[PDB]
mmCIF file of C-alpha atoms and ligand atoms in Angstrom:
data_model
loop_
_atom_site.group_PDB
_atom_site.id
_atom_site.type_symbol
_atom_site.label_atom_id
_atom_site.label_comp_id
_atom_site.label_asym_id
_atom_site.label_seq_id
_atom_site.Cartn_x
_atom_site.Cartn_y
_atom_site.Cartn_z
ATOM 1 C CA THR A 1 112.236 100.445 -131.637
ATOM 2 C CA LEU A 2 113.561 103.913 -132.484
ATOM 3 C CA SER A 3 111.538 105.756 -135.145
ATOM 4 C CA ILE A 4 111.399 109.154 -136.797
ATOM 5 C CA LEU A 5 107.986 110.810 -136.957
ATOM 6 C CA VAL A 6 107.762 113.834 -139.292
ATOM 7 C CA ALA A 7 105.647 115.719 -141.798
ATOM 8 C CA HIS A 8 107.609 117.388 -144.614
ATOM 9 C CA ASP A 9 106.649 119.039 -147.884
ATOM 10 C CA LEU A 10 107.873 118.399 -151.435
ATOM 11 C CA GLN A 11 111.118 120.235 -150.672
ATOM 12 C CA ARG A 12 111.473 118.733 -147.153
ATOM 13 C CA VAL A 13 110.288 121.899 -145.379
ATOM 14 C CA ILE A 14 109.085 121.055 -141.864
ATOM 15 C CA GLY A 15 108.708 124.428 -140.193
ATOM 16 C CA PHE A 16 108.458 128.184 -140.489
ATOM 17 C CA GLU A 17 108.941 130.645 -137.647
ATOM 18 C CA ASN A 18 108.759 127.853 -135.053
ATOM 19 C CA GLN A 19 105.359 126.690 -136.374
ATOM 20 C CA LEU A 20 104.029 124.147 -138.890
ATOM 21 C CA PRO A 21 103.605 125.838 -142.278
ATOM 22 C CA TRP A 22 100.355 123.979 -143.027
ATOM 23 C CA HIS A 23 97.072 123.106 -141.353
ATOM 24 C CA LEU A 24 96.204 119.404 -141.739
ATOM 25 C CA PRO A 25 93.933 117.772 -139.102
ATOM 26 C CA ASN A 26 94.290 114.242 -140.517
ATOM 27 C CA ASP A 27 98.028 114.364 -139.905
ATOM 28 C CA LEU A 28 97.441 115.274 -136.273
ATOM 29 C CA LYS A 29 95.188 112.197 -136.087
ATOM 30 C CA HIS A 30 98.018 110.178 -137.628
ATOM 31 C CA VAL A 31 100.462 111.370 -134.968
ATOM 32 C CA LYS A 32 97.886 110.689 -132.233
ATOM 33 C CA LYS A 33 97.368 107.124 -133.480
ATOM 34 C CA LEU A 34 101.078 106.303 -133.780
ATOM 35 C CA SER A 35 102.405 107.872 -130.589
ATOM 36 C CA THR A 36 99.674 107.530 -127.939
ATOM 37 C CA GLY A 37 100.978 105.140 -125.291
ATOM 38 C CA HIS A 38 104.557 105.553 -126.440
ATOM 39 C CA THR A 39 107.424 108.070 -126.152
ATOM 40 C CA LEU A 40 108.186 111.302 -128.043
ATOM 41 C CA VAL A 41 111.678 112.801 -127.985
ATOM 42 C CA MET A 42 111.904 116.395 -129.180
ATOM 43 C CA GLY A 43 114.328 119.324 -129.189
ATOM 44 C CA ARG A 44 113.727 122.342 -126.964
ATOM 45 C CA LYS A 45 112.418 124.648 -129.724
ATOM 46 C CA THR A 46 109.930 122.045 -130.885
ATOM 47 C CA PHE A 47 108.643 121.697 -127.340
ATOM 48 C CA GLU A 48 108.224 125.458 -126.988
ATOM 49 C CA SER A 49 106.220 125.589 -130.225
ATOM 50 C CA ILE A 50 103.741 123.159 -128.673
ATOM 51 C CA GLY A 51 103.956 124.824 -125.245
ATOM 52 C CA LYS A 52 102.657 121.906 -123.177
ATOM 53 C CA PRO A 53 103.258 118.147 -123.289
ATOM 54 C CA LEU A 54 101.037 116.074 -125.573
ATOM 55 C CA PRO A 55 98.427 113.965 -123.726
ATOM 56 C CA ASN A 56 98.668 110.219 -123.087
ATOM 57 C CA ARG A 57 102.295 109.591 -123.966
ATOM 58 C CA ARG A 58 105.735 110.193 -122.505
ATOM 59 C CA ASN A 59 107.178 113.608 -123.465
ATOM 60 C CA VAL A 60 110.965 113.834 -123.439
ATOM 61 C CA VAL A 61 112.756 117.101 -124.209
ATOM 62 C CA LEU A 62 116.426 117.355 -125.197
ATOM 63 C CA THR A 63 118.067 120.600 -124.058
ATOM 64 C CA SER A 64 121.394 121.851 -122.660
ATOM 65 C CA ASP A 65 119.429 123.983 -120.158
ATOM 66 C CA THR A 66 119.781 122.518 -116.644
ATOM 67 C CA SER A 67 117.053 124.948 -115.543
ATOM 68 C CA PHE A 68 114.537 123.142 -117.736
ATOM 69 C CA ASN A 69 111.965 121.344 -115.610
ATOM 70 C CA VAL A 70 108.399 121.271 -116.917
ATOM 71 C CA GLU A 71 105.434 119.476 -115.347
ATOM 72 C CA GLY A 72 104.590 116.433 -117.470
ATOM 73 C CA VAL A 73 107.947 116.472 -119.246
ATOM 74 C CA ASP A 74 111.084 114.381 -118.819
ATOM 75 C CA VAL A 75 114.372 116.112 -119.644
ATOM 76 C CA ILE A 76 117.506 114.695 -121.180
ATOM 77 C CA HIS A 77 120.738 116.565 -121.849
ATOM 78 C CA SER A 78 122.462 114.275 -124.340
ATOM 79 C CA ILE A 79 121.692 112.316 -127.508
ATOM 80 C CA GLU A 80 123.087 109.234 -125.777
ATOM 81 C CA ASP A 81 120.263 109.447 -123.210
ATOM 82 C CA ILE A 82 117.745 108.643 -125.953
ATOM 83 C CA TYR A 83 119.041 105.086 -126.156
ATOM 84 C CA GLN A 84 118.131 104.498 -122.505
ATOM 85 C CA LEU A 85 114.452 105.157 -123.084
ATOM 86 C CA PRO A 86 112.247 102.036 -122.947
ATOM 87 C CA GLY A 87 109.511 101.133 -125.423
ATOM 88 C CA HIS A 88 108.733 102.558 -128.847
ATOM 89 C CA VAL A 89 110.552 105.886 -129.046
ATOM 90 C CA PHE A 90 109.648 108.448 -131.722
ATOM 91 C CA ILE A 91 112.109 111.198 -132.674
ATOM 92 C CA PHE A 92 109.541 113.980 -133.062
ATOM 93 C CA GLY A 93 111.627 116.972 -134.230
ATOM 94 C CA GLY A 94 112.814 119.425 -135.047
ATOM 95 C CA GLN A 95 115.442 119.970 -137.742
ATOM 96 C CA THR A 96 118.408 119.667 -135.371
ATOM 97 C CA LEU A 97 117.217 116.423 -133.765
ATOM 98 C CA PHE A 98 116.253 114.920 -137.155
ATOM 99 C CA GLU A 99 119.764 115.742 -138.469
ATOM 100 C CA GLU A 100 121.307 114.126 -135.386
ATOM 101 C CA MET A 101 119.177 110.999 -135.517
ATOM 102 C CA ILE A 102 118.358 110.113 -139.150
ATOM 103 C CA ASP A 103 121.431 107.853 -139.441
ATOM 104 C CA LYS A 104 120.493 106.142 -136.147
ATOM 105 C CA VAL A 105 116.784 105.288 -136.327
ATOM 106 C CA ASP A 106 115.294 101.917 -137.349
ATOM 107 C CA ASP A 107 112.502 103.402 -139.437
ATOM 108 C CA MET A 108 110.682 106.597 -140.358
ATOM 109 C CA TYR A 109 106.994 107.524 -140.347
ATOM 110 C CA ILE A 110 106.872 110.358 -142.846
ATOM 111 C CA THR A 111 103.829 112.327 -143.927
ATOM 112 C CA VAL A 112 104.729 113.835 -147.291
ATOM 113 C CA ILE A 113 102.780 117.070 -147.639
ATOM 114 C CA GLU A 114 102.396 117.323 -151.432
ATOM 115 C CA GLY A 115 102.876 121.058 -151.805
ATOM 116 C CA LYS A 116 105.629 123.702 -151.703
ATOM 117 C CA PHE A 117 105.619 125.937 -148.623
ATOM 118 C CA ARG A 118 107.908 128.714 -147.414
ATOM 119 C CA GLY A 119 110.115 127.215 -144.709
ATOM 120 C CA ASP A 120 113.061 128.014 -142.512
ATOM 121 C CA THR A 121 113.605 124.477 -141.206
ATOM 122 C CA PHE A 122 114.074 121.232 -143.115
ATOM 123 C CA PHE A 123 114.138 117.475 -142.844
ATOM 124 C CA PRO A 124 117.550 116.162 -143.965
ATOM 125 C CA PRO A 125 117.887 114.652 -147.462
ATOM 126 C CA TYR A 126 117.455 110.892 -147.744
ATOM 127 C CA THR A 127 117.453 108.395 -150.608
ATOM 128 C CA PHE A 128 115.146 105.425 -151.216
ATOM 129 C CA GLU A 129 118.352 103.525 -151.917
ATOM 130 C CA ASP A 130 118.764 103.254 -148.137
ATOM 131 C CA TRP A 131 115.089 102.885 -147.231
ATOM 132 C CA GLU A 132 112.455 100.325 -148.152
ATOM 133 C CA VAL A 133 108.859 101.470 -148.518
ATOM 134 C CA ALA A 134 106.974 99.346 -145.972
ATOM 135 C CA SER A 135 103.791 101.199 -146.877
ATOM 136 C CA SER A 136 102.559 104.238 -148.781
ATOM 137 C CA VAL A 137 99.026 105.533 -148.299
ATOM 138 C CA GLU A 138 97.426 108.546 -149.972
ATOM 139 C CA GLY A 139 95.642 110.720 -147.472
ATOM 140 C CA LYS A 140 91.957 111.430 -147.994
ATOM 141 C CA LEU A 141 90.989 114.996 -148.810
ATOM 142 C CA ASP A 142 87.873 116.761 -147.592
ATOM 143 C CA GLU A 143 86.499 120.052 -146.302
ATOM 144 C CA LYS A 144 88.851 119.953 -143.324
ATOM 145 C CA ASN A 145 91.862 118.405 -145.097
ATOM 146 C CA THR A 146 92.632 120.174 -148.328
ATOM 147 C CA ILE A 147 96.348 119.593 -148.977
ATOM 148 C CA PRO A 148 97.256 116.296 -150.682
ATOM 149 C CA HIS A 149 99.447 114.128 -148.518
ATOM 150 C CA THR A 150 100.957 110.661 -148.374
ATOM 151 C CA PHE A 151 101.761 108.535 -145.329
ATOM 152 C CA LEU A 152 105.055 106.700 -145.807
ATOM 153 C CA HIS A 153 106.501 104.078 -143.507
ATOM 154 C CA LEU A 154 110.182 103.598 -144.458
ATOM 155 C CA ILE A 155 112.438 100.929 -142.977
ATOM 156 C CA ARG A 156 116.220 101.090 -143.105
ATOM 157 C CA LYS A 157 117.646 98.558 -145.556
HETATM 158 N N1 NAP B 1 106.673 119.192 -139.645
HETATM 159 C C1 NAP B 1 107.127 118.436 -138.652
HETATM 160 O O1 NAP B 1 106.976 117.051 -138.652
HETATM 161 C C2 NAP B 1 107.825 119.063 -137.486
HETATM 162 C C3 NAP B 1 108.076 118.318 -136.336
HETATM 163 C C4 NAP B 1 108.794 118.898 -135.296
HETATM 164 C C5 NAP B 1 109.258 120.199 -135.414
HETATM 165 N N2 NAP B 1 108.991 120.920 -136.544
HETATM 166 C C6 NAP B 1 109.503 122.299 -136.711
HETATM 167 O O2 NAP B 1 110.923 122.328 -136.590
HETATM 168 C C7 NAP B 1 111.330 123.648 -136.216
HETATM 169 C C8 NAP B 1 112.297 123.619 -135.032
HETATM 170 O O3 NAP B 1 113.487 122.903 -135.328
HETATM 171 P P1 NAP B 1 114.926 123.422 -134.781
HETATM 172 O O4 NAP B 1 116.019 122.619 -135.320
HETATM 173 O O5 NAP B 1 114.942 124.890 -134.967
HETATM 174 O O6 NAP B 1 114.807 123.096 -133.211
HETATM 175 P P2 NAP B 1 114.703 121.759 -132.331
HETATM 176 O O7 NAP B 1 115.471 120.658 -132.953
HETATM 177 O O8 NAP B 1 113.279 121.455 -132.063
HETATM 178 O O9 NAP B 1 115.425 122.276 -130.988
HETATM 179 C C9 NAP B 1 116.827 122.448 -130.992
HETATM 180 C C10 NAP B 1 117.282 122.520 -129.547
HETATM 181 O O10 NAP B 1 117.303 121.227 -128.982
HETATM 182 C C11 NAP B 1 118.385 121.097 -128.094
HETATM 183 N N3 NAP B 1 119.331 120.086 -128.583
HETATM 184 C C12 NAP B 1 119.386 119.526 -129.843
HETATM 185 N N4 NAP B 1 120.397 118.630 -129.859
HETATM 186 C C13 NAP B 1 120.983 118.608 -128.623
HETATM 187 C C14 NAP B 1 122.042 117.887 -128.070
HETATM 188 N N5 NAP B 1 122.739 116.993 -128.769
HETATM 189 N N6 NAP B 1 122.400 118.101 -126.755
HETATM 190 C C15 NAP B 1 121.705 119.015 -125.992
HETATM 191 N N7 NAP B 1 120.661 119.734 -126.527
HETATM 192 C C16 NAP B 1 120.308 119.525 -127.823
HETATM 193 C C17 NAP B 1 119.035 122.465 -128.023
HETATM 194 O O11 NAP B 1 118.296 123.138 -127.042
HETATM 195 P P3 NAP B 1 118.963 124.296 -126.114
HETATM 196 O O12 NAP B 1 119.325 125.399 -127.060
HETATM 197 O O13 NAP B 1 117.855 124.702 -125.176
HETATM 198 O O14 NAP B 1 120.167 123.657 -125.470
HETATM 199 C C18 NAP B 1 118.699 123.045 -129.376
HETATM 200 O O15 NAP B 1 118.726 124.453 -129.398
HETATM 201 C C19 NAP B 1 110.044 124.400 -135.870
HETATM 202 O O16 NAP B 1 109.656 125.222 -136.957
HETATM 203 C C20 NAP B 1 108.993 123.325 -135.721
HETATM 204 O O17 NAP B 1 107.748 123.815 -136.148
HETATM 205 C C21 NAP B 1 108.294 120.361 -137.580
HETATM 206 C C1 UC9 B 2 101.111 117.062 -136.412
HETATM 207 C C2 UC9 B 2 102.462 117.550 -136.959
HETATM 208 C C3 UC9 B 2 103.366 116.489 -137.113
HETATM 209 N N1 UC9 B 2 103.139 115.538 -138.032
HETATM 210 C C4 UC9 B 2 103.982 114.509 -138.204
HETATM 211 N N2 UC9 B 2 103.719 113.586 -139.138
HETATM 212 N N3 UC9 B 2 105.089 114.397 -137.450
HETATM 213 C C5 UC9 B 2 105.369 115.320 -136.521
HETATM 214 N N4 UC9 B 2 106.470 115.221 -135.779
HETATM 215 C C6 UC9 B 2 104.501 116.399 -136.321
HETATM 216 C C7 UC9 B 2 104.715 117.427 -135.339
HETATM 217 C C8 UC9 B 2 104.824 118.295 -134.559
HETATM 218 C C9 UC9 B 2 104.837 119.421 -133.591
HETATM 219 C C10 UC9 B 2 105.635 120.571 -134.145
HETATM 220 C C11 UC9 B 2 103.460 119.718 -133.388
HETATM 221 C C12 UC9 B 2 102.881 120.929 -133.737
HETATM 222 C C13 UC9 B 2 101.566 121.143 -133.558
HETATM 223 C C14 UC9 B 2 100.754 120.207 -133.033
HETATM 224 C C15 UC9 B 2 101.243 119.012 -132.664
HETATM 225 C C16 UC9 B 2 100.407 118.005 -132.125
HETATM 226 C C17 UC9 B 2 99.337 118.285 -131.268
HETATM 227 C C18 UC9 B 2 98.530 117.262 -130.754
HETATM 228 C C19 UC9 B 2 98.781 115.933 -131.092
HETATM 229 C C20 UC9 B 2 97.996 114.893 -130.582
HETATM 230 O O1 UC9 B 2 96.915 115.137 -129.991
HETATM 231 O O2 UC9 B 2 98.394 113.705 -130.684
HETATM 232 C C21 UC9 B 2 99.843 115.644 -131.944
HETATM 233 C C22 UC9 B 2 100.643 116.667 -132.455
HETATM 234 C C23 UC9 B 2 102.609 118.745 -132.855
HETATM 235 O O3 UC9 B 2 99.475 120.686 -132.949
HETATM 236 C C24 UC9 B 2 99.488 121.792 -133.868
HETATM 237 O O4 UC9 B 2 100.857 122.269 -133.837
#
């Protein structure tokens, strides 16, 4: 299975200055639950924002840089290499990879952050005409999680 995994706001903002625009611990938990034991594919800038590979899953970084070789990270140099990866593969970001892959993936795990943030990077537009809502779950708010959010699993029609 090839899936997108993304958090985007009401206007599809996903990033600002190579960081997440919001702080939302429950969404990190969400990512942890979905991707532990599986594979994340991410663009080079996304990897650099994190700085080190995420624990307990395969980290794959797409870059044109043949000098790229990071401990704990597998490198690919082409989109076509993604299709060779075994198991459940999550396209993890950022804007450029999402734009390249949204017409290719089987499904999308989207956390809709229900606010309007300043962004410089965006998830591409999509229509529910092409995507069935497998599930939609309102996130729980508390002291540590103060922005409303919804977990969507969308499957290509
Ligand atoms: N909210 C979320 O769910 C979420 C998730 C992930 C990322 N983000 C955000 O997204 C933003 C970054 O997105 P971005 O588009 O600027 O960067 P990006 O997609 O993470 O990285 C782009 C880089 O990936 C490499 N690349 C992409 N396609 C390639 C291809 N076909 N062949 C070879 N290399 C390829 C290139 O690296 P080289 O230039 O090294 O060749 C390119 O410069 C950040 O703000 C980050 O915080 C948000
Ligand atoms: C948690 C953010 C997020 N949510 C959703 N729904 N999809 C995504 N693709 C990303 C993402 C991402 C990258 C940019 C990112 C940025 C971070 C992160 C992480 C991150 C760190 C740890 C774990 C984990 O332990 O599983 C997961 C994501 C991941 O920590 C704070 O800054």
